[PDB]
Design a protein around this ligand. Sequence first.
Ligand code: NA
Ligand code: NA
Lengths: 304, 304
Amino acid sequence: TPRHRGIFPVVPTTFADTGDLDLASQKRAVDFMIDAGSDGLCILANFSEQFAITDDERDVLTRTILEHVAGRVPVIVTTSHYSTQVCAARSLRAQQLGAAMVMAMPPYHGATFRVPEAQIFEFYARVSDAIAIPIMVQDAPASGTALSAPFLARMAREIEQVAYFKIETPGAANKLRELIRLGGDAIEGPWDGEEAITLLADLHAGATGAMTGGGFPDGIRPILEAWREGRHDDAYARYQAWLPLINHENRQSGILTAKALMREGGVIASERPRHPMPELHPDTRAELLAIARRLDPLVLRWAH
Amino acid sequence: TPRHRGIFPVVPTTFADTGDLDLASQKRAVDFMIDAGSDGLCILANFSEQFAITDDERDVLTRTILEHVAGRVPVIVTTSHYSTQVCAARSLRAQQLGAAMVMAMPPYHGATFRVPEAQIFEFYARVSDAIAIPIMVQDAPASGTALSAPFLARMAREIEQVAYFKIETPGAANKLRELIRLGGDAIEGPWDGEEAITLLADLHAGATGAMTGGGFPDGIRPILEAWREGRHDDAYARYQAWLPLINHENRQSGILTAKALMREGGVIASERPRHPMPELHPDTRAELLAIARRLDPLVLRWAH
Ligand code: NA
Ligand code: NA
């Protein structure tokens, strides 16, 4: 019954080699990910290097990418901010610009500044009140913020637009199972993240969507489709084939993985981060390409 | 002889009751802090609630405050951003508008995104390359980033504008002593923070400046003056008197401490944070004002 399910990869932010936004490459990345079979796209998330860009740049990218997707697949726009009012305003604008959904971390800042549960609940209520499209709660280590399954489920039951979840804290499968149990019908989207590293456990737990890196959603989507067709052994085989690539993303090359692949495939002009994020080490990048070449992903043969 | 020394309190950000910037109260807060005898002022720092505002608000406050200060005391503008190029651009703009100094945390994001030391060194080197005013490195728990005393001293010696330090990690006094021993003449400003909680110990370690809360710099500055005069017993007596207030700010009322006291004193219109930062609990605020009234600080008798 959910409005959304399947694979929702994170669109990377493309820069020129000198760090300015490279919107021409940005559009190509988007077109490639659509062609790779993505069910939807998530933009301006932490895999998109959003911590490295300014508010003005976020807005340029949100308009640029939504216009370019052109209604082809639903887009989740990341709108996280400590201020409830700022987040609410970003989420309304994203809606007005054509987002299907927004995603927000709970409000926090840095390693030190956190917000009591009661006020986190208010933050999401007020953002929900401002908008008419669903909210995805991002449950990730970078917030340093504990969001228990009961609390998450209580938000989904009591707050109209809270309906989707990116569960990326350790033991996601266990937590997904509990969220689903406690939240019932209100949990529209029990999804995972972490570049699909725990995808097969999370599907057994009831995950119905996955937010992966943007480099090879074509390789991962069939795992979700096999699971959806009731073919758990076939899902195992597909996961086994691609797991070394998912694992190298998750443990070695990280955020830049999708960009190294796209730059190798000629999809984007530069795979660099903005300074000071470090470049991929040479052996790490060489290893990454070597693994990808064993798997023949679309990004290395995208004839556009 | 350092270019700057003494008390450099953090200016709070003043909002209207409904969360909008209240620039009229902002200017009054600034004037009160100057009348309290501040040697300089630090703006848009984490005690200024900088995480709850937008980039556009940051620029507005930077312009407005520098203009209102009118060259009367030096201003340190906080320019922290994960992006080097972004921090550089903020820092250059601050210099254009009359800032005496910028302060930046090392690049990081949230609880999880850090940058290796070599990249941090490059981050500060390129910011220094951009500007002609000094940089203060902010060494605080919120970045979750370790900056060793040897590493700080090496930036000080090797990077032209790196010359000041706000040392607010645990054991500040020991770390200051080592910073000064290693960095020699390049350490222009070995300063502390944490609302002056460890001020007397940090003075013994050789601190020459203190970045405090903005509510009662008139109470704390004479501690540094007594210390400069060589009257360590008189410093102790002054520290003892004001310590419960400094302790309640540090442990109980936190960021909002300066705003509660200014609102009580009719300096600003509203002491509220932006949601979802929680309001002071009532016994916490009542206790704060009770301690403050035992000490007759200027903020409660500022007839303007
Ligand atoms: Na993620
Ligand atoms: Na501080």
